[PDB]
Write a protein that binds this ligand. Structure first.
Ligand SMILES: CCCCCCCCCCCCCCCCCC(=O)OC[C@H](COP(=O)([O-])OC[C@H](O)COP(=O)([O-])OC[C@H](COC(=O)CCCCCCCCCCCCCCCCC)OC(=O)CCCCCCCCCCCCCCCCC)OC(=O)CCCCCCCCCCCCCCCCC
Ligand SMILES: CCCCCCCCCCCCCCCCCC(=O)OC[C@H](COP(=O)([O-])OCC[N+](C)(C)C)OC(=O)CCCCCCCCCCCCCCCCC
Ligand SMILES: CCCCCCCCCCCCCCCCCC(=O)OC[C@H](COP(=O)([O-])OCC[N+](C)(C)C)OC(=O)CCCCCCCCCCCCCCCCC
Ligand SMILES: CCCCCCCCCCCCCCCCCC(=O)OC[C@H](COP(=O)(O)OCCN)OC(=O)CCCCCCCCCCCCCCCCC
Ligand SMILES: CCCCCCCCCCCCCCCCCC(=O)OC[C@H](COP(=O)(O)OCCN)OC(=O)CCCCCCCCCCCCCCCCC
Ligand SMILES: CCCCCCCCCCCCCCCCCC(=O)OC[C@H](COP(=O)(O)OCCN)OC(=O)CCCCCCCCCCCCCCCCC
Ligand SMILES: *C(=O)CCCCCCCCCCCCC
Lengths: 87, 13, 155, 165, 122, 79, 111, 62, 459, 177, 65, 171
């Protein structure tokens, strides 16, 4: 039960969900793609990205932490900090 | 295999 | 701890009110004491009577279970507004409408059980018939007496 | 009631453990083929709860209705008992519809597994209980009342008709 | 269950009340009506320790069925015929109670038609 | 240790009710962005899940077959 | 009388034995949950014998085995009533509890 | 040592409880009070031998 | 009784001639020897009390109070030796002397054949208690608390002195054994009314009665641990002992004088228990629980039925053990956080599991979990007061709800929940502290096996 | 309302929080994923209708009646994540989150059972107590007069300094001990 | 080998859980059909409910007056 | 054992085993296993212990209290006589308590032994129980917790005055 996450697995699943988003081209996306300035996404789109992260990994990111995740790398780091991976 | 240390109070006493 | 950081009398001059607000670590425009009717509150602040459940749970509190900080002026009933006790949190249905629905449902159910008791259902049969003078010895009748002859017939 | 209700909690908790402590039924579904022994035992438990004929819950609850109708009784209590009997079918198929039927609603890292002989054997023995225990007990016990067995056809078929409705 | 509507939505005058009936003599309408024959002796069902509800006019089939059910252990599926006999005789007692109820209903119809004929007579 | 995810390109929404949702959204000038994220729930082995009477009648065929064999066995056994 | 009452009290004393085991321990166990599950399976097997010999004759009794306290007219004793209700409920509770504990050997395994 | 659980947990408590019931509890009055067994018409008493007479002949119904 | 008074007095040379590091071990050892010797008082008969001399006797009421009293001294010595370790050796010996002297007064308070000697010892118990509270109490308010403790008891008991001397002049004797046979029925008059009040109000204060109980959430709280143990466990029970002695002489006037005070108790146990639901001071919560439990003993003595006396003396012994253990548990956390605020230290089962189990057992015996002698006394008092009036069960039953409510809240506030972050001086439990908890709880649970020795003279 | 860094919620943050709560309570109302997918795109269309409103008075009014809309149309028992506050598994393992200082109070017979762990723990305590005075003098040289205005903490500024007030963030227990 | 977790797809099923589940489902339907074939009266009814109107007045004793 | 007259039991009428089926019940096999494996070793250990009892026989006695003058023939405030009357009264009160306990044990044993026919077959024990409870109530009830022979004699004199006045007003 409860398989342990890694940074590579969290990165793969985060970029996997973001490649499944029709407003993101999967040939431009990297781990450091800022959503508002590199991918050009709206704030509503960033909220939907955080909510897809919540539905993906099964836990809630609060709003004060949702609004400050502006790239996939910070999302992977936040899930790393809240899941204590590479113990 | 990646055994983690369980922090627990002193059960000696 | 010292004397002028302990609660004192009711503030009546505005400088004593400002000293009280500086003591309880809160703003002077936010500081409101209990009304001086003689109930023993003194200068203690009248916080707006919110349960600790209503506090922001995602905040990095000093005391996470109490949802309360260090130096924060506690409510007078902080032992009462813990999450193990009285919750003042907002409910999706109005309180008065909840009381109307609960009281009306319970009163309607009690009235309809009384209606069903006043007019009960039954089966279209006679009484259950028992031999030996309606089982006189079995029900605990004394054998030295003799009951009236209960006789059932065939039909 | 001990058999099938303990088994319904055990099957629900097997679902809860397979879905990483998920207890809300709006994040379940698609567990028909996924947890087939849990599915089988949960369906047998809900059918014993609703009084499927000659499962264990038939051997008491049905007779209860056959005594609740045929007696000098508070009639509002009888009508609310029958509405409760319908509601049992409603929440049982609610459990089966949101937990087993439909499509998945749980998250994407599927760790669905139930292959421990502890889990399988423990639900297995209460499954055999929920099949046969009403028959075994209701034939082995001595009679302590006189069972009311003569009643009209609408009054004999009351519990089953209300459950099917 | 239609008698519920005939007594509640109808009148309670012609309908027999459940708790107090028979309100007529048993000989009123019956020439030479025989009594009910109890088969099991009172000491026999005393020693058979039957429930006081179960000591009705059809307890002898129950005594036979309990003697079978003791004498057939552990084969607990081998006394179905004695149980069927007891269930059939309980059905017969229930039919006799239904006959008493229908007798009371037809006698109250008779008294209603009697008082209506007396009211239209004079 | 390392877990290899399936391909993100295969979860297309053609053949799903996500296709019907995109049609009934594009009928009024909208577009669904998260269809391929939800596309796995309606595809694969989780497609063609049974109905409710199909769920109740699980094992009804084999149970009825064993029933017919046992009724024939007790019909032959009495004679 | 000698079989019925003995296995009746053996069921309860057998259930109290792992409480004495867990209170009188020093070591780390060789699967104490397996020990309690084996104890309750054995208690079900033990309690089925008085239930079967109740199904045979209807044999009921009362084991008022230990006088505890007499408050002037109230003689409270350790008194166990073996009637229809105990004879039917004790094997059902033991069978269900045995299934719940073999469930718990998997469910509460990370605890 | 393969059926030690059948010895220390079944059989030694059966020994202890049977000794305690037989020589300390049954020796005291009304401690183990037992319901007398159910006598049917047609039985025979083991202590006496008096056969209980059977029931009256049935008015056969079916 | 002189086989107990002389060893208790020989405890004074045993503590003043001891080596400086041996003055706890020797007093603990020889006080446990006296407590083992205390079992000879169980030579009780169904008709006659164990009558020793013209000065001392011991029936089945005084015997369990004596055994509890002689048992409580080693437990107080174990409880009070940690926080008095930095104390001067002479004041340490004076503290042990005050405890020994208080035990000495108590053991001949409960065995007083004659009632004015009962009064002299009963008021002699004030002075070591007063000195212990007002000298080794921790906070400022020990002085005021000692004042309230002294002047409620003396104001209640100086009319008791005049009443007892009036009985000596009227009846001729204040021997209890004589007054068993020379008791006259007390008729209805205002003179006999104030006779009743002067005989009863001292013990009403010592129980305490509701409304007169204001000394107790100051005296029990501002005391040290040994002072709180002896005040809760024994010194409240002097009032019940004295009422059970003195209502012999107050019949049939008690049958219509008890009506207000029963109300004051039947409402008081609803109020004080409710006060326990809002106490931030844990030691004050235990104090108001002691008031709530002794209200039942007051009711049971004032309805004066046999079931009520059996339940009241069982409740007195059981509450002595349970309340002493609860004060010792509160001390076991005070010696780690140095505060008595209950909401301060939380989650202590995560850190101290066995001590949390001792809290659990003390809370279950506080809420009268059967078959504890707590429940035996509670239940028998409830039986007798249902016989008194059939409506009292409401005031009983609601109390048995509220008594559960603060007994587990005390368990949930302190032991459960999330632990306090900033408190890091929570040491592991000492062997001494767990020894103290076990020596409270194991006799309490052994008395459930054979409770007839704590059911009084009319078992 | 109540935030550690900001003294308030901006209008943009209030709109985003209403959008997230509206989608979550709608998903609680709309159990199945395709039906929620359809109605969630409709709700996104409703949020994208009044997106470019420049009057802050009119925008605040629209936000206020949208909150009234939401409060009338919320699920009574919404979906809560299990470890989310109000969920079935929230703060479940707090009874196993033993703090680190309890390891300092062990007996030596159970400290010697883990020699490398405590031999490695001593340099953590060493690094902590020689980082402490540097980070305190970092905090008292950077905080303005009148106390810190916000609850935000500075990072480490030198190569060798650890960030100020770091020990109870780094040595907090795991969420699954 | 034990069941390995999968991602966004149907999990690995053991043959054993499928054959156990199908065996107990067939056992349920076998038992229901068996006990409905043999008993058939615990559901539908044991004895016929008589119609009280169909009883003549001669057996119920109603002299026409 | 005990005395069968103070604790009465009717003789056991057990029915003979008349099995009709061909399947053997497990009760006979488990009864034979209980006789072989359990009852015989317990009987052997009890016979060993019984021999060790017989190797040293010694007796305890039932303490007899001779009758002393009761409270009616003791002078008022004469503690030497009325003390002995009070001790006699308290021992008699405790013995009457145990008499009521014996009749309660008879009642409960009759109810359990008769089973479902208890309401008919235990009318005699119920009559004895009602008699002894009425006697214990007229003798000792409502005396209070400070009961004495004086209180009991005063209750008896009040009851006798009531009985005498009821006889006198009805004649
Ligand atoms: C005369 C000879 C007598 C011999 C027999 C003695 C009978 C018992 C006497 C009292 C026993 C108390 C001691 C155990 C509890 C206290 C210590 C403790 O917690 O240790 C934990 C520890 C095991 O746990 P751990 O994992 O190591 O650490 C604990 C964890 O940290 C975490 O802890 P935890 O919370 O997980 O574990 C605590 C757990 C927590 O569980 C509970 O709190 C639940 C209990 C209440 C509900 C269930 C019971 C309800 C009532 C039913 C039972 C009574 C009636 C039954 C009779 C039939 C029906 C009438 O409690 C238990 O496991 C105890 C089981 C037995 C409970 C008995 C009732 C106590 C409840 C409160 C009062 C109730 C009314 C009074 C009853 C009096 C009975 C005699 O046990 C020991 O180390 C035991 C040491 C030896 C104990 C000796 C006790 C007797 C000493 C007397 C000396 C002189 C006489 C000579 C006889 C000596 C016999 C050996
Ligand atoms: C693992 C070790 C097990 C034991 C090893 C040693 C024994 C080995 C086996 C051989 C048996 C030994 C001889 C038999 C035992 C002694 C027999 C005997 O006469 O014993 C004297 C008596 C028998 O009763 P009694 O009636 O003779 O004496 C009672 C005392 N008077 C009359 C004064 C009231 O006591 C016992 O047997 C004590 C043990 C009883 C067992 C049950 C205890 C339950 C405890 C519950 C506490 C709370 C209950 C509250 C509620 C009660 C109900 C309302
Ligand atoms: C803790 C605070 C509360 C304490 C309460 C203490 C009890 C309350 C009542 C006490 C009354 C005073 C003692 C009465 C002793 C009676 C003895 C006796 O023989 O009485 C019959 C005697 C009767 O005289 P006699 O007995 O000689 O008469 C012969 C008999 N006849 C009547 C037939 C002629 O009573 C008295 O003489 C007076 C009794 C009343 C006294 C009133 C004065 C005191 C007022 C109350 C003070 C209460 C405490 C004050 C302090 C409070 C706190 C600061
Ligand atoms: C046969 C007839 C049947 C008749 C049935 C009806 C009669 C009884 C009427 C109802 C009485 C009981 C119900 C009212 C009190 C319920 C109190 C309670 O349980 O509170 C629970 C509350 C926390 O609950 P909750 O918020 O749901 O927890 C999840 C956390 N978010 O927890 C808290 O808030 C903690 C509170 C602690 C202090 C409790 C204070 C209230 C105590 C009330 C005692 C009432 C006694 C009444 C006795 C009557 C006797 C005649
Ligand atoms: C038990 C006896 C079952 C058979 C008699 C009742 C049959 C019946 O009324 O069936 C109606 C219905 C099935 O038909 P329906 O669901 O409308 O069709 C959807 C396409 N399959 O619904 C069902 O058959 C499902 C309900 C069956 C209840 C079984 C347990 C009681
Ligand atoms: C505050 C802290 C908590 C409380 C602690 C306790 C405080 C109260 C203690 C005393 C309570 C009152 C005394 C007990 C009353 C018992 C019955 C009684 O005496 O009632 C008062 C009396 C009733 O009249 P009656 O009984 O006819 O008087 C003639 C007597 N032969 O009534 C009358 O005659 C009318 C009133 C006359 C004056 C009475 C004053 C003296 C008694 C109190 C002192
Ligand atoms: C007359 O109706 C007698 C039957 C008992 C009272 C009415 C019960 C009504 C519910 C049972 C029948 C339901 C049919 C759908």
């Amino acid at each position: 039960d409860a398989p342990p996450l890694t940074l590579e697995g969290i990165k793969d699943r985060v970029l996997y969900v973001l490649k499944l988003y029709d407003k993101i081209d999967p040939e431009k996306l990297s781990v450091n793609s800022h959503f508002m300035k590199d991918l050009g996404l709206d704030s509503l789109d960033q909220v939907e990205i955080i909510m897809a992260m919540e539905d993906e990994f099964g836990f809630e990111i609060p709003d004060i932490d949702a609004e400050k995740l502006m790239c996939p790398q910070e999302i992977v780091d936040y899930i790393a900090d809240k899941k204590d991976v590479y113990e | 295999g990646k055994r983690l240390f369980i922090i627990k109070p002193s059960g000696f006493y | 701890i010292t004397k002028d950081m302990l609660p004192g009398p009711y503030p009546k001059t505005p400088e004593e009110r400002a000293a009280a607000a500086k003591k309880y670590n809160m703003r002077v425009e936010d500081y409101e004491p209990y009304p001086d009717d003689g109930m023993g509150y003194g200068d203690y602040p009248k916080l707006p009577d919110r349960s600790q459940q209503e506090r922001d749970p995602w905040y990095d509190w000093d005391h996470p279970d109490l949802r309360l900080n260090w130096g924060e002026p506690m409510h007078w009933d902080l032992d009462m507004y813990i999450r193990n006790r009285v919750d003042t949190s907002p409910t999706p249905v109005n309180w008065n409408l909840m009381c109307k629905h609960l009281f009306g449902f319970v009163a309607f159910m009690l009235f309809m059980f009384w209606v069903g008791e006043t007019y009960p259902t039954y089966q279209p049969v006679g009484p259950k018939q028992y031999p030996y003078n309606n089982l006189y010895l079995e029900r605990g009748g004394d054998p030295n007496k003799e009951p009236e002859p209960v006789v059932h017939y065939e039909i | 009631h001990a058999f099938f209700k303990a088994m319904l909690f055990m099957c629900s908790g097997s679902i809860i453990h397979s879905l990483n402590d998920e207890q809300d039924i709006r994040k379940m579904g698609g567990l028909f083929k996924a947890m087939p022994f849990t599915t089988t035992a949960l369906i047998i438990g809900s059918l014993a709860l609703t009084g499927m004929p000659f499962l264990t819950g038939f051997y008491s609850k049905d007779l209860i209705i056959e005594s609740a109708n045929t007696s000098y009784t508070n009639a509002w209590a009888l009508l609310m008992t029958l509405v409760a009997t319908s509601f049992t079918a409603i929440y049982s198929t609610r459990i089966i519809f949101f937990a087993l039927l439909g499509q998945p609603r749980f998250p994407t890292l599927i760790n669905i597994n139930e292959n421990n002989p502890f889990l399988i054997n423990s639900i297995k023995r209460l499954l055999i209980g929920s099949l046969f225990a009403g028959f075994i007990i209701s034939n082995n016990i001595p009679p302590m009342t006189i069972p009311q067995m003569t009643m009209p056809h609408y009054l004999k078929m009351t519990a089953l008709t209300v459950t099917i409705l | 269950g239609a008698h519920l509507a005939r007594r509640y939505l109808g009148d309670a005058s012609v309908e027999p009340e459940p708790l107090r009936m028979p309100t007529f003599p048993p000989d009123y309408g019956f020439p030479e009506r025989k009594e009910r024959e109890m088969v099991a002796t009172q000491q026999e069902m005393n020693d058979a320790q039957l429930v006081l509800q179960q000591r009705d006019y059809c307890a002898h089939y129950l005594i036979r069925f309990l003697k079978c059910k003791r004498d057939s252990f552990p084969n607990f599926l081998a006394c179905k015929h004695e149980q069927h006999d007891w269930d059939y005789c309980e059905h017969l007692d229930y039919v006799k109670r239904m006959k008493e109820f229908e007798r009371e209903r037809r006698l109250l119809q008779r008294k209603k038609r009697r008082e209506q004929r007396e009211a239209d007579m004079a | 240790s390392k877990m290899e995810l399936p391909d993100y390109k295969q979860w297309k929404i053609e053949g799903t009710p996500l296709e019907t949702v995109q049609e009934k959204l594009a009928a009024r000038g909208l577009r669904d962005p998260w269809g391929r994220n939800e596309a796995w729930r309606y595809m694969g082995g989780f497609a063609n899940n049974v109905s409710f009477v199909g769920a109740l009648l699980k094992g009804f065929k084999w149970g009825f077959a064993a029933f017919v064999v046992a009724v024939g066995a007790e019909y032959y056994l009495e004679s | 009388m000698n079989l019925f009452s003995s296995l009746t009290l053996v069921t309860l004393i057998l259930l109290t034995m792992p409480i004495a085991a867990i209170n009188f321990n020093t070591h780390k166990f060789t699967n104490y949950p397996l020990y309690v599950k084996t104890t309750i399976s054995c208690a079900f097997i033990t309690s089925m014998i008085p239930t079967m010999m109740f199904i045979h004759t209807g044999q009921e009794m009362i084991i008022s085995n230990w006088h505890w306290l007499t408050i002037q007219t109230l003689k409270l004793s350790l008194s166990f009533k073996m009637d229809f209700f105990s004879m039917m409920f004790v094997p059902v509770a033991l069978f269900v509890t045995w299934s719940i504990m073999e469930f718990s050997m998997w469910y509460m395994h990370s605890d | 040592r393969h059926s030690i659980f059948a010895f220390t947990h079944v059989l030694i408590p059966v020994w202890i409880i049977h000794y305690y019931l037989k020589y300390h509890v049954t020796t005291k009055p009304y401690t183990i009070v037992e319901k007398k067994p159910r006598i049917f018409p047609g039985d025979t008493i083991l202590e006496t031998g008096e056969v209980i007479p059977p029931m009256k002949e049935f008015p056969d119904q079916h | 009784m002189l086989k107990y008074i002389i060893p208790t007095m020989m405890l004074m040379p045993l503590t003043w001639l001891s080596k400086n590091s041996m003055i706890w071990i020797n007093t603990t050892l020889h006080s446990l020897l006296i407590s083992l010797t205390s079992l000879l008082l169980l030579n009780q008969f169904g008709d006659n009390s164990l009558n020793f001399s013209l000065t001392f006797f011991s029936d089945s009421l005084s015997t369990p109070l004596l055994i509890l009293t002689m048992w409580l001294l080693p437990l107080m010595l174990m409880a009070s030796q940690h926080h008095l370790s930095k104390e001067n050796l002479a004041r340490k010996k004076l503290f042990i002397s005050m405890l020994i002297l208080l035990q000495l007064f108590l053991i001949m308070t409960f065995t007083a054949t004659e009632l004015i000697f009962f009064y002299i010892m009963f008021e002699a118990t004030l002075v070591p208690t007063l000195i212990i509270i007002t000298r080794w109490g921790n906070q400022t308010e020990r002085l005021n608390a000692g004042l309230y403790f002294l002047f409620y008891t003396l104001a209640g008991s100086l009319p008791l002195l005049v009443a007892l001397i009036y009985i000596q002049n009227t009846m001729g004797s204040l021997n209890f054994l004589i007054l068993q046979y020379w008791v006259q029925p007390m008729p209805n008059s205002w003179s006999n009314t104030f006779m009743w009040l002067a005989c009863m109000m001292a013990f009403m204060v010592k129980m305490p009665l509701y409304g007169l109980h204001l000394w107790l959430p100051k005296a029990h709280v501002e005391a040290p641990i040994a002072g709180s143990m002896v005040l809760a466990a024994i010194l409240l029970k002097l009032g019940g002992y004295g009422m059970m002695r003195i209502t012999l002489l107050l019949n049939p006037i008690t049958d219509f004088m008890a009506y207000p005070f029963i109300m004051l108790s039947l409402w008081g146990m609803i109020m004080t228990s409710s006060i326990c639901l809002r106490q931030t001071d844990l030691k004050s919560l235990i104090a108001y629980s002691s008031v709530s439990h002794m209200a039942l003993v007051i009711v049971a003595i004032l309805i004066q039925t046999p079931w009520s006396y059996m339940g009241a003396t069982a409740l007195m012994i059981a509450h002595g053990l349970t309340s002493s253990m609860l004060f010792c548990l509160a001390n076991s956390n005070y010696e780690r956080v140095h505060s008595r605020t209950m909401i301060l230290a939380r989650g202590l089962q995560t850190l101290l599991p066995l001590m949390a189990a001792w809290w659990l057992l003390a809370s279950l015996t506080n809420l009268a979990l059967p078959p504890s002698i707590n429940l035996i006394g509670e239940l028998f008092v409830v039986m007798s007061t249902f016989s008194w009036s059939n409506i009292t069960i409401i005031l009983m039953g609601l109390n048995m709800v509220i008594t559960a409510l603060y007994s587990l809240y005390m368990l949930i506030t302190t032991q459960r929940g999330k632990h306090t972050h900033h408190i890091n001086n929570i040491l592991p439990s000492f062997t001494r502290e767990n020894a103290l908890m076990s020596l409270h709880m194991l006799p309490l649970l052994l008395l459930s096996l054979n409770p007839k020795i704590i059911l009084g003279p009319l078992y | 309302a109540f935030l550690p860094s900001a003294a308030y919620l901006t209008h943009q943050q209030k709109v985003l929080q209403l959008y997230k709560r509206a989608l979550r309570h709608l998903e609680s109302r709309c159990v199945h994923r395709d039906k929620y997918r359809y109605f969630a795109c409709l709700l996104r269309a409703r949020f994208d209708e009044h997106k470019n409103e420049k009057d802050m008075v009119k925008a605040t009014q629209l936000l206020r009646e949208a909150e009234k809309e939401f409060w009338h149309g919320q699920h009574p028992q919404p979906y809560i994540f299990p470890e989310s506050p109000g969920g079935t598994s929230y703060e479940r393992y707090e009874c196993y989150k033993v703090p680190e200082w309890c390891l300092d109070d062990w007996h030596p017979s159970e400290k010697a059972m883990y020699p490398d762990y405590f031999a490695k723990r001593e340099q953590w305590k060493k690094l902590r107590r020689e980082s402490w005075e540097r980070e305190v003098k970092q905090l008292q040289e950077e905080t303005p007069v009148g106390g810190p205005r916000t609850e935000a903490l500075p990072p480490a500024r030198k190569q060798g300094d650890l960030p100020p007030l770091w020990w109870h963030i780094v040595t907090r227990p795991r969420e699954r001990p | 080998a034990h069941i390995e977790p999968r991602y966004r797809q149907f999990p690995q099923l053991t043959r054993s859980q499928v054959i156990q589940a199908e065996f107990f489902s067939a056992t349920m339907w076998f038992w229901i059909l068996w006990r409905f074939w043999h008993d058939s009266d615990a559901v539908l009814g044991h004895f016929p409910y008589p119609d009280p109107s169909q009883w003549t007045d001669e057996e119920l004793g109603i002299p026409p007056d | 054992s005990w005395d069968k007259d103070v604790y009465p039991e009717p003789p056991r009428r057990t029915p003979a085993p008349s099995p009709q089926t061909s399947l053997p019940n497990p009760i006979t096999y488990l009864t034979k296993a209980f006789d072989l494996l359990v009852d015989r070793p317990v009987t052997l250990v009890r016979e060993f212990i019984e021999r060790q009892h017989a190797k040293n026989k010694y007796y305890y006695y039932h303490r007899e209290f001779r009758r002393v003058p009761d409270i009616t023939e003791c002078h008022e405030k004469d503690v030497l006589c009325m003390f002995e009357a009070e001790m006699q009264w308290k021992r008699d009160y405790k013995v009457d308590q145990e008499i009521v306990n014996i009749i309660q044990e008879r009642l409960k044993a009759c109810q359990q032994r008769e089973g479902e026919s208890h309401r008919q077959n235990c009318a005699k024990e119920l009559q004895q129980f009602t008699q002894v409870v009425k006697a214990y109530q007229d003798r000792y009830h409502d005396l209070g917790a400070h009961y004495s022979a004086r209180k009991c004699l005063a209750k008896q004199k009040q009851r006798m005055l009531a009985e005498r006045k009821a006889t006198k007003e009805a004649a």
